[PDB]
Every structure is written in C-alpha cells, then in structure tokens.
Design a protein around this nucleic acid. Structure first.
Ligand SMILES: [Mg+2]
Ligand SMILES: [Mg+2]
Ligand SMILES: [Mg+2]
Ligand SMILES: [Mg+2]
Ligand SMILES: [Mg+2]
Ligand SMILES: [Mg+2]
Ligand SMILES: [Mg+2]
Ligand SMILES: [Mg+2]
Ligand SMILES: [Mg+2]
Ligand SMILES: [Mg+2]
Ligand SMILES: [Mg+2]
Ligand SMILES: [Mg+2]
Ligand SMILES: [Mg+2]
Ligand SMILES: [Mg+2]
Ligand SMILES: [Mg+2]
Ligand SMILES: [Mg+2]
Ligand SMILES: [Mg+2]
Ligand SMILES: [Mg+2]
Ligand SMILES: [Mg+2]
Ligand SMILES: [Mg+2]
Ligand SMILES: [Mg+2]
Ligand SMILES: [Mg+2]
Ligand SMILES: [Mg+2]
Ligand SMILES: [Mg+2]
Ligand SMILES: [Mg+2]
Ligand SMILES: [Mg+2]
Ligand SMILES: [Mg+2]
Ligand SMILES: [Mg+2]
Ligand SMILES: [Mg+2]
Ligand SMILES: [Mg+2]
Ligand SMILES: [Mg+2]
Ligand SMILES: [Mg+2]
Ligand SMILES: [Mg+2]
Ligand SMILES: [Mg+2]
Ligand SMILES: [Mg+2]
Ligand SMILES: [Zn+2]
Lengths: 52, 71, 119, 50, 100, 86
RNA sequence: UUGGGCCCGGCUCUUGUCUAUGUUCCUUGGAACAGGACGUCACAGAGGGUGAGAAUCCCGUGCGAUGAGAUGACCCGGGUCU
RNA sequence: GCGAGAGACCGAUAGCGAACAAGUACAGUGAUGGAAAGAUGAAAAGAACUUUGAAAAGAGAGUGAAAAAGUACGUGAAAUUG
RNA sequence: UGCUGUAAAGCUGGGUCGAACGGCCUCUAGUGCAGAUCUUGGUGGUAGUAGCAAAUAUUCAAAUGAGAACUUUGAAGACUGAAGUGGGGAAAGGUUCCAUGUCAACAGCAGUUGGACAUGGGUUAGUCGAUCCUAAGAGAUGGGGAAGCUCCGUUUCAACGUGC
RNA sequence: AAACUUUCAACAACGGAUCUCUUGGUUCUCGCAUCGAUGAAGAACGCAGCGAAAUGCGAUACGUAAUAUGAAUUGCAGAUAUUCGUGAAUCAUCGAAUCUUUGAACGCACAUUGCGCCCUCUGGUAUUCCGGAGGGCAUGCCUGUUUGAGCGUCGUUU
C-alpha cells in the first residue's frame, strides 16, 4: 500500500470529557469529514494494521 | 433602449470594456457616419460596457437605427 | 467553410486588408441580425474567415522580415530559434569542438588503432 | 457597498454569470451524466468571500 | 527486556531505518541491461577486443602473498623492455600504469 | 459578551484578494500574502505542508507552455515546416 | 606514424502502409458469443469490441516486407575534392 | 518529469483524499482544513392514447426477455415499519 | 423443505434473481467480531411527546383562486409617535432591486403571497466620490549587517536633475 | 371477546448490505532527459449558433496555419459547407502563428483597471494643448563604444 495512506490528515484526539472515544478526529468545520475519526485501523479512511 | 432611440435621439450600444468615450465617438463616426453630441458610458452587472450615444440634431437616431437594421 | 488559405496566399497586403474590412462589416451585420434570429450559425464561418485572413497577413509579413534579416548576425529574438533556455545557453558546435594545439598534436600522433587478436 | 472597486465588481459579474441553471439540451447528449448544475449559490446562504 | 539464556544481540535499528531500505528488485533487469550494454559495446568496435590487456601482479599483505591476480597496467619499464611507448600502447589495447 | 455580541463587530477585512494568487490572503496592513508570500520574489512554500504544495503546483493550472515541451523534444526541437508528400 | 570538407549507405531513434482461417447446419434464447455436428488457420489459441464464455465476425496478435523523416567533431563502409 | 510493460495487490466504508464537473463542494480573517458521491436496459424502446383529479399523481393501456428493471432504476440483507 | 456433523459448518426442496462459480491435492494471507464512551452509514423507543406563549390587535365585506385566519382592494379598529416601526447613508452583502410567471423544496401553521423558484429588464457625471495631498505610519535606493531567508536605515560617510 | 402488546410467516415499506463487475488506485520493472527575461509554473477575466461546470482556447479566443488522413458532426439547428476531392471531421500529427490582464514580472504605482516621459504617424485652426494608433523607458553584473571627473599622475609653455 502507499506509504502515507491513511496518514494525510492533521487529526488530533479530542481527549476525554466530550463523551466520545479517544480516537484522533479531523479538525476544522464546514465539511462532513470534520470531527470524523482518523489514523486507526478500525477507522474508515485510516491506514490498515501493519501496512504491507 | 429603444425608448431612448425614439424619445431622446440616443443610440444604445454594447462597447468593449477597454474603450473610452473618445474612442467610442470616433468609432461611431467611422462606422455609421454620425456625429455624437455625447457618449455616456456604463459597466453593467454582467460585466459588459453599455454606451448611450446622443447624436447631434443633424442626425435622426431612428433613421440610423433602421439603417443598421435593428428597428 | 469560408475562404481558402491558398487563394489568400496569392493576394497582396491591400487586397487582404480590404477583405478583412469586408469580413468585419459582415460580422457586424450578422451580430445585428442575431438580435432577432437569434440562432445564427454563419457567425462561426465569418469568425474563422477573419482568423484566416489575419493569420495569412501575419505570416506574409513574417517571411518579409525573415528575408530582410537573412544572413545577418543579429536578428529579432522572435525570429531566432526557440528551443529551450538551456539549449540556447549551450556551446555551439564550433565552440565545443575548439581544441588546443597540444591536444590536436597528441590526437593526430596517437589515434585509436584498429586491430584484432589471434593471428 | 455602492462604492466598490472594479476588481470587486468584475468578480461579482462572474459570480452572477456562474449562478445559472443547467441548459436543458445538455441532458439529451449521449453519455451525459450531468443532471443539474451542482455549483449553485444563494446570496444569503453561501458568501463569496471576496 | 533481557530474558532467558539467549545471545545478546546488536540490532542497529534505532534510527529511521525504513527510509533507507534498498531492495534489489531490479537484479534481473540490471543483469539483462548490463548484458545489452556489453553486446552493444562489443559490436560497435568489433573485431577489436573490448578488454585491454592487463598485467599480472602479486597481491599485497602477508595473507595474499601467495595469490597472483590481474593488475591495473603494465609498468613503463615493462613496456620499455618490449619496445612499446605508453602513448602508443594505450591505442593498441594495452593498459599502462605509471604508478607501479 | 465575547461570543455572540462580539461576533457582531466583524466588518473590517484583514485580508483582500492577492494579485499573484487571487486567494484573499493579502494582508492589507502587512501588504503581504499569507498564501503565496507576495510581493516576495519567491513563492511561499514549506516542506511541512505537502498538501499545500499539492494544491498549487505544476499541473494544477493550464501549463500553457510546458504542455508542449515533451512533444517538441520528441521531434528534436524542429525548425521549419512540414513538407508535402509528392 | 599522419590533415580537412561534402555524397551515398549501414547502425540508432521516431513514424506511415501492407497480411491466415466459418459467421456452415440443429437446439435454447430477446440477442449465440452457449450446447451439439462438420470443419479451417496457426511463427497468429495475447488482449479488446460486438445484444451471454468468440483463435476462426471486427480491431488487433504472429511473421515479416517496404516508404518517410530525423540524428551522431567526438560510430564505420565506401566514394569524391583539396 | 516523460514514455512503456507488468503483478499470488485493492475492488467503491477497499484502493490515492479524489474510479464521478476532486484538491471539487464547503469551513476558516488567515496559515490551512477538506468530504460525500460508480451500476435501468442489448437498445430509451424513458410509457403514445383513454379516464379520475386543481395539480402531483392514480387507474387502464403501451415498450420491453423482464416494469418482481420506470431514471426515488441491477440484485435489494438487517435494524425499523404497515 | 429437510438431511448430515458433538461442533465450527456442509448439503438440499421452494421462492427471488441474472453471469459467473465450485469439489478435491497443495500454496498464500490485509482470513472469522457482541462488546473497544470502537469507525462510517442507517434505524428505533422516547413521540404525534416537549413544544411552536416577549415586542397592545385585530374585524367585516368584495376580488382572485381548486382551495383564503395569513394574497389583493375597500371599510374600520389600533400602534410606532420625529432620540420613529419615518426619510437617507458609512462598513458589510452582491442582484436580494423591477416586471412577468410561478409553488416541488424553503418561509419550524398556511400560502394564490415572498428577500424562495424561473425568465427577462435595470445602475448614464467635466461639477457627487475615487483619483491628488500629507497624518500616525509603511517602504524602495546608496550603503552597512547577516550562511542565508533577509535585517537596519529614509537622505542616512552617495559624483543622486529621465532639471527648468 | 375486541382493541392493545409480543412472536412468526407472506406480501409491501424503510434502508442500501450482499453478489457480480471496473476507462480508478497501488506496487514492481524497463526506457528516456525536455521549464523560464525568445517571459515559466501559477493567477484573474473572458471566448461556442443555442453552455452553467469539467476540458480546450485568448479579442485570430471549445480555436488560425501547416502535414497526414479521407466522409463525417450529431442534443437540436445551419450554410453565401463538403464527396472519383486543394476535401467533412480530427488536441491524428504539428515544425508556422495568435497568445487579454497578470505573475520571477521590468516606466512609476497598485485595497486604484491611478500617473508619467521619449520616438514615429494621425485628428482637432498646434514643436508646446486635447484625442487616437504603433514602438519604447526595471535592476545587478560582463565585454566593448562614447562622453566625462580627480594637482592620482606623465610630457611641454610662461
Ligand atoms: Mg485507506
Ligand atoms: Mg460613469
Ligand atoms: Mg448571515
Ligand atoms: Mg487590522
Ligand atoms: Mg463478451
Ligand atoms: Mg474511497
Ligand atoms: Mg475518502
Ligand atoms: Mg446501485
Ligand atoms: Mg428479471
Ligand atoms: Mg431487475
Ligand atoms: Mg431495485
Ligand atoms: Mg425485517
Ligand atoms: Mg447481465
Ligand atoms: Mg479450481
Ligand atoms: Mg484484519
Ligand atoms: Mg457489530
Ligand atoms: Mg468479545
Ligand atoms: Mg457504540
Ligand atoms: Mg453512530
Ligand atoms: Mg402539546
Ligand atoms: Mg416557551
Ligand atoms: Mg400612540
Ligand atoms: Mg420620545
Ligand atoms: Mg436607515
Ligand atoms: Mg421584490
Ligand atoms: Mg411552513
Ligand atoms: Mg405547504
Ligand atoms: Mg433568486
Ligand atoms: Mg468634487
Ligand atoms: Mg513620517
Ligand atoms: Mg526597509
Ligand atoms: Mg541595497
Ligand atoms: Mg461489492
Ligand atoms: Mg495496474
Ligand atoms: Mg489609494
Ligand atoms: Zn498570494
């Protein structure tokens, strides 16, 4: 797979205290991608576990 | 625009955006052999330039409009 | 499809400018008629005729300038060759083939021989 | 405002001209996929940022 | 971190090693293109041999005294002994070494 | 009053359109573009923003001249005109 | 031991043109490119298209043949003039 | 970058962010951030006409191999629902 | 619809469907989900529920229309009460302006109405502004720093007139 | 007993899984070396008979010339368009051109479509004013040309 697949995001975890899982999330606003999880093998659009 | 051709002896033209009133007066003189009393210009909301050219009393703008062929 | 470029190439500057004027008044008349038709495809033909006459006028004047400057040391940069900036900065064949007299004497004295083995 | 620059008014002219519906004869072309103009803009809804 | 009776290892992988991994997928392609270069060079200058004649020299060090291998070029004394000038020798497929 | 009441006092643009890149990043008082760095001779670009290089690079515009350099190279940078066949 | 300039080739690169054999019969099906029968070509049974799994319908594929343009002091083989 | 050939690779939540008018729409003063979104049918043959209705629509009819394919289009699971 | 297996599962009848797919011997792996306040999408109960209650206030008739609490006109009753719910502008918006048509969506009821939707039309300057001046300030040049991106400086250690 | 609630099946919904595709991606290999002051990359604004976008192009504006090829284009329309041919369509090819406003961006300036100056031609009773067309005026540095500056300095004359 591409060396940077799933890692072209500036996502940062919201931390705890906001009633959501601690996975990193996309910042900004105004698009539906905003606030969506990133970087995780369980995340849609993240990178696979142990990329080939 | 045709109310001006009729009432005010004024021909209304679309004109290039880059041209000024001196060039418009010369252009109408060379194209239609008519003397302009004045040229009032205007840039329209769609980005094109419109010229209100009032002719001297020597010329009848309705006759010029028929000669060009749009009335 | 309008005027023929080979017939245009047999005309003078004055005949071409006269035909350009006629084409421009024809286009103006068509633009007046477009106010009422309003679909008027002949405008495309007149527009491309104006493009052809302008092209032939420009080309004719450009071989005139090329003939004026033929063989001169300095010619206009739009009449010079247009390769790449680097290829224009590159040494000419004469400059690249310039050689010191020491190197020419050694090149002449010891050329690469043609030979074979096993005889 | 009424007092605007030429560069501004030229951007507003292009913004007006891009805000039109799809011409309907385009949907009849072969292998056409555009059903509507997807880049419409309302003045109150989305701002030009000019 | 240290466990069992195992050899102690030196695995030097604490830098960004994955940015400098050269995998020779092109071994066969380079072999084939190397062969084509070799054929083209030979056919350009045939029947002239592609290799200059090299001398035979003793290998240095106490470990390779016994072995003898191809050197770089024949010395000026050797070419003098066979009556060939070095400038001429370089043009008839003989390699010269002014250093040996 | 730092939220809704203060947001009502926004009518003074800090940035306007840039002449080089047309992006509305030209700081009016600084007279500099935060996007392309205009009026500096060089274009503003950073290796820590690779997506920003993607957004504005060769191929994102018209390439009105580099389009044809490959096609001119393949023909050896011809000078002259094509000859009609007999 | 030996200088230089042009003309045609060869090599290199790009490009044009040209090429074998079923659309025979029955059944199903909207469509045969499916099944069955009889075949053909094959230096071509790669791939694609065509109303369903098509070597043989079409483009190609394979085999070569033959034109055009270029390019190269620093590739050679011939000429030719100094 | 330009031009090619491939694969025990992925198969539309995968594979590049992007198979689509994708670095698009949109957000942010700004640096920047940045999606969703493929599939009727071989062919629109995209339903003439009649009828009820203000209309949207419905009911007949019609095309199609199929309308248990009608563009709110292949198949059409589950949650949930009549 | 059943059969087989302790099981993971395999096979099969009927319906739907429309273009590929399986058994066996081996190879290989991005190979098995109920959970991770997991991810993305979708859907419930809650529930026809909370609610749709600031800014005094509406009513009769006619017209239009398939349809009128909400549109138009008339009649009335009211309010803002000149530091206005009046008449203009600056910033900001950008066609919202006007006419015609028009109701799928939007206007948290409605809609024949609309800043919505569709089609057109519309902004006329020697005298109004910009343009010019300088303000706080910004900033080239000559120079001097700085590896450099650039920093200082604004007539400064300058042979400074595209002079009239 | 209904209704209601719950379960199941059929049909119908909701929704878009599954299956099957694929002009995309990803990775590997092979070959090649070509941006720009002769104005690039990029930006803005325009251009079609009827177009918003994408694609293409620049007032010669979904293109002009040329070479090749050889009858189309197509959603509709239409030739003062074409067919045993200087001939339809063609980013097929491409060697000639056009190439707005810009941008290293170059007369000065630019949050302005602001303001000059020089040359030639031209209109207005004009070397001087007003208008128009075309061509010019950036900086550092190099070679050269010309004109100079300095008791820096050589020769000669009171
Ligand atoms: Mg991914
Ligand atoms: Mg004005
Ligand atoms: Mg708002
Ligand atoms: Mg400020
Ligand atoms: Mg097939
Ligand atoms: Mg994707
Ligand atoms: Mg994505
Ligand atoms: Mg689908
Ligand atoms: Mg079916
Ligand atoms: Mg179906
Ligand atoms: Mg379906
Ligand atoms: Mg269910
Ligand atoms: Mg099928
Ligand atoms: Mg098998
Ligand atoms: Mg896994
Ligand atoms: Mg689950
Ligand atoms: Mg578990
Ligand atoms: Mg959960
Ligand atoms: Mg969720
Ligand atoms: Mg209630
Ligand atoms: Mg309340
Ligand atoms: Mg009162
Ligand atoms: Mg009061
Ligand atoms: Mg007011
Ligand atoms: Mg109104
Ligand atoms: Mg409502
Ligand atoms: Mg309603
Ligand atoms: Mg509107
Ligand atoms: Mg004034
Ligand atoms: Mg000051
Ligand atoms: Mg400074
Ligand atoms: Mg300086
Ligand atoms: Mg699938
Ligand atoms: Mg591939
Ligand atoms: Mg100003
Ligand atoms: Zn900028």
């Amino acid at each position: 797979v591409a060396e940077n697949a799933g890692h072209q995001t500036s996502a940062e975890s919201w931390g705890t205290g906001r009633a959501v899982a601690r996975i990193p999330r996309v910042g900004g606003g105004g698009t539906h991608r905003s606030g969506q999880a990133a970087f995780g093998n369980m995340c849609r659009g993240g990178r696979m576990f142990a990329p080939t | 625009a045709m109310k001006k051709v009729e009432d005010g002896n004024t021909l209304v033209f679309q004109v290039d955006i880059k041209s000024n009133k001196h060039q418009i007066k010369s252009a109408v003189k060379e194209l239609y052999d008519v003397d302009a009393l004045y040229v009032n210009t205007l840039i329209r909301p769609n980005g094109t330039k419109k010229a209100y050219i009032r002719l001297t009393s020597d010329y009848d703008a309705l006759d010029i409009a028929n000669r060009i062929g749009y009335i | 499809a309008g005027v023929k470029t080979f017939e245009l190439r047999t005309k003078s500057k004055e005949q071409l400018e006269s035909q350009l004027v006629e084409l421009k008044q024809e286009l103006a008349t068509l633009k007046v008629q477009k106010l009422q038709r309003p679909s008027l495809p002949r405008i495309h033909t007149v527009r491309k005729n104006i493009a052809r006459v302008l092209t032939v006028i420009n080309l004719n004047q450009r071989e005139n300038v090329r003939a004026f400057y033929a063989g001169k040391k300095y010619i206009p940069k739009d009449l010079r060759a247009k390769k790449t900036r680097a290829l224009r900065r590159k040494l000419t064949k004469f400059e690249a083939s310039q050689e010191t007299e020491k190197a020419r004497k050694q090149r002449i004295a010891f050329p690469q021989r043609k030979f074979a083995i096993k005889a | 405002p009424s007092q605007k620059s030429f560069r501004t008014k030229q951007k507003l002219a292009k913004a007006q001209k891009q805000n039109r519906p799809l011409p309907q004869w385009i949907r009849l072309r072969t292998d056409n996929k555009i059903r509507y103009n997807a880049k419409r803009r309302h003045w109150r809804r989305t701002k030009l940022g000019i | 971190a240290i466990s069992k009776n195992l050899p102690l290892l030196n695995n030097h992988f604490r830098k960004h090693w994955q940015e400098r991994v050269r995998v020779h997928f092109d071994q066969a392609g380079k072999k084939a293109s190397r062969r084509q270069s070799r054929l083209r060079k030979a056919a350009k200058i045939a029947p002239r041999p592609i290799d200059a004649l090299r001398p035979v020299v003793r290998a240095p060090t106490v470990k390779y005294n016994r072995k003898v291998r191809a050197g770089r070029g024949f010395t000026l004394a050797e070419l003098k002994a066979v009556g060939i000038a070095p400038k001429y020798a370089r043009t008839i497929g003989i390699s010269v070494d002014h250093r040996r | 009053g730092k939220g809704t009441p203060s947001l009502g006092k926004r009518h003074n643009k800090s940035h306007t359109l840039c002449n080089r890149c047309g992006r509305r990043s030209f700081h009016v008082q600084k007279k500099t573009c935060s996007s392309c760095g205009y009026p500096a001779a060089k274009m503003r670009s950073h290796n820590w923003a690779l997506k920003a290089k993607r957004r504005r690079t060769t191929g994102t515009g018209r390439m009105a001249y580099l389009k044809h350099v490959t096609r001119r190279f393949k023909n050896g940078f011809q000078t002259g005109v094509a000859k009609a066949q007999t």
